[PDB]
């Protein structure tokens with residue numbers, strides 16, 4: 001089933017035709033971005049990042065016994081009432097394996113003393129395995145939850161020891177946590193560390209750290225008001241997007257030599273940019 | 284749905300036909316209160332309220348149509364009198380705790396007529412309203428209308444207000460009904476407006492609401508001014524719906540939107 | 556219960572002042588304070604006009620310099636009351652249908668002061684609600700060692716203004732180094748420690764058991780306010796509010812003031828074994844309120 005052609009055999013002829021059409025679309029990027037989040041206006045970069053998270057990366061394992069990460073995580077920080085929770089809501093709507101929470105999460109080892117068995121009830125992380133775990137109110141988590149989230153991000157496992165029962169449970173998923181800056185106002189003068197109350201390792205493990213600003217643009221305000229009134233008054237359907245996403249995940253691309261050299265050059269340029277003192281970077 | 288008699292319906296429509304029906308009904312709720320016309324208009328709109336719309340068709344959460352009103356000011360303006368008149372007619376906000384306000388915010392995450400008092404028991408003109416009441420931005424943003432009731436130190440006004448207070452502590456409801464408008468007629472008007480009047484947004488009213496929101500955002504773009512938020516658009520929609528219900532109109536007019544904006548401006552005391 | 560002979564013995568006029576003086580005869584002076592304590596013990600009359608619940612419980616707060624026998628009055632009230640619990644600042648449910656004596660009231664916790672606000676406004680504890688129909692008697696001391704008439708009530712005794720305003724009557728007791736008064740007090744204390752009893756007075760002090768019997772008998776009656784007398788209430792309250800707006804420095808004669816006046820008048824008529832509030836009750840309530848007002852002024 002993991003072979004793409006095997007699922008294509010499971011899929012009907014029309015489904016394969018639609019998949020081929022989606023694969024041959026030149027503007028597939030823009031069409032997917034528009035269809036995935038139709039209601040939200042603007043903020044195309046965040047939509048692109050979320051789409052890339054949904055597609056994901058190719059996992060690898062070293063000969064030394066270690067395992068390489070094949071998932072990416074996105075954290076959204078923005079001013080209040082900037083529709084950041086709407087992103088999580090639409091992601092949960094689209095993804096059947098998404099698990100929405102509001103900051104229990106790991107596991108619950110309840111011993112059935114009748115049978116003397118430690119039956120474990122899966123937490124939010126476990127249920128969201130091999131998918132996306134949307135965690136709103138990321139900055140309101142307790143210290144225990146922060147430790148558990150950092151451990152999940154670092155070792156993609158869940159370790160539990162209740163009533164002298166030590167166990168380790170695998171958990172491989174992407175996190176789309178969202179949180180507000182300290183005080184509700186993003187100070188461009190301060191860096192991300194000062195604006196957001198998060199532990200350093202958790203902040204470091206994240207990628208594609210998107211930041212939202214209200215910007216009070218009058219034209220955008222008119223567009224938003226008109227959109228709200230029209231609500232009071234898609235190139236590809238969700239099923240087609242799901243089929244294409246599964247088909248793409250069944251693929252496994254590999255890096256080429258020219259791409260390798262270009263990656264090295266771009267990394268050199270990025271590190272030179274960061275080392276440059278012309279403008280201080282936020283991280 | 285009361286079986287409103289045709290004579291009663293005719294009388295209610297004749298009342299609605301009067302151009303002063305908004306002000307007449309605002310005064311009809313305890314006209315013995317010294318002025319406070321805008322506050323009475325807001326309370327009248329709260330009694331009428333907006334139109335209940337179920338937005339499950341759009342997938343989005345259903346929008347609340349109830350209007351939340353906050354009355355702020357020092358004691359001595361007879362707020363308790365008008366509150367009791369409203370309660371009879373229709374059946375500790377100063378001391379709010381931060382844990383309780385957080386619980387209330389969490390509850391609101393899933394019509395309120397509140398009376399506020401200063402922490403110092405006296406209104407400080409040098410201090411802003413938010414500082415004087417000691418309330419958060421999140422909670423204050425969930426009140427559609429916030430009326431600033433100042434207590435002037437005038438001997439004539441204070442004498443009138445005290446006399447009215449002791450009258451309320453002494454006069455029976457029979458004399459109040461005999462002297463003022465009959466309360467049954469006002470109750471029938473309110474029931475008729477809340478039952479049969481279901482105004483709908485027109486294109487002109489829609490454009491007026493959108494332009495009003497744009498103007499509010501422009502006001503918020505200025506330095507030191509409160510930035511407009513999307514909940515303000517919904518508040519304006521609810522106020523326009525209530526005002527349209529006042530005139531028994533089944534369509535929301537631009538006049539309703541302008542009146543809602545004027546009432547919101549007078550409540551917030553933007554000019555000062 | 557009681558007998559008709561006791562009814563004749565206590566039915567003589569001015570027995571109000573007699574029972575007032577019979578409370579804690581050892582303490583020298585503080586007659587108006589004793590009258591207020593008697594009113595608190597008897598309490599007002601509950602009413603439900605058109606379903607509007609109107610509680611009759613009376614709350615009295617004693618404030619002023621330390622060592623002026625506050626604890627003596629608190630303990631005597633606690634003992635004489637049929638049901639009461641004595642407690643410090645750092646319970647209320649057990650005090651239901653009784654008197655709750657709270658000494659060192661200024662050293663409480665504002666978290667519990669919110670619940671005290673709830674009880675003083677609702678007589679219930681909402682966690683399921685438990686009845687808390689307890690009249691509260693409180694004693695407080697200044698936080699600077701002495702009371703300063705220059706400073707306000709809140710400054711001298713650090714406590715929220717609203718909670719101070721809730722109390723029906725607020726008493727300020729100041730200790731003054733007057734030679735003659737000190738000499739009389741010294742003679743009184745020496746006599747008490749010598750003869751093991753209070754000095755002789757004009758009226759024989761009442762016994763505790765008879766006092767309890769008569770308090771219960773007065774509690775039996777439930778007088779009501781006639782509307783004819785209410786016109787004089789209008790004149791009195793409008794004059795009081797005019798005086799309040801004359802100088803706004805003190806606490807305003809808000810609606811709570813009028814409600815407390817009504818409760819005090821009803822309680823006074825209750826003690827007189829009458830079913831109708833009269834002019835004398837309003838006069839006495841006004842006298843007590845003005846005495847408390849003058850005590851506050853310094």
Ligand SMILES: Nc1ncnc2c1ncn2[C@@H]1O[C@H](COP(=O)(O)OP(=O)(O)OP(=O)(O)O)[C@@H](O)[C@H]1O
Nearest residue numbers: 039040041042079080081082083084085086224513
């Ligand atoms: N382009 C847009 N930007 C922002 N909001 C938009 C946009 N288009 C529509 N909206 C609407 O504006 C509102 C944004 O506020 P919303 O309640 O979604 O904020 P939020 O992210 O949940 O805030 P918070 O978590 O900080 O309380 C929503 O009703 C959303 O549908």
Ligand SMILES: Nc1ncnc2c1ncn2[C@@H]1O[C@H](COP(=O)(O)OP(=O)(O)OP(=O)(O)O)[C@@H](O)[C@H]1O
Nearest residue numbers: 581582583584620621622623624625626627696744
């Ligand atoms: N009329 C009176 N005036 C002043 N003192 C009196 C009087 N009668 C008795 N005393 C004496 O005053 C003292 C009362 O002390 P007590 O412990 O009651 O003070 P308190 O003011 O309640 O205390 P605090 O407020 O500091 O907690 C006793 O020594 C008592 O003999």
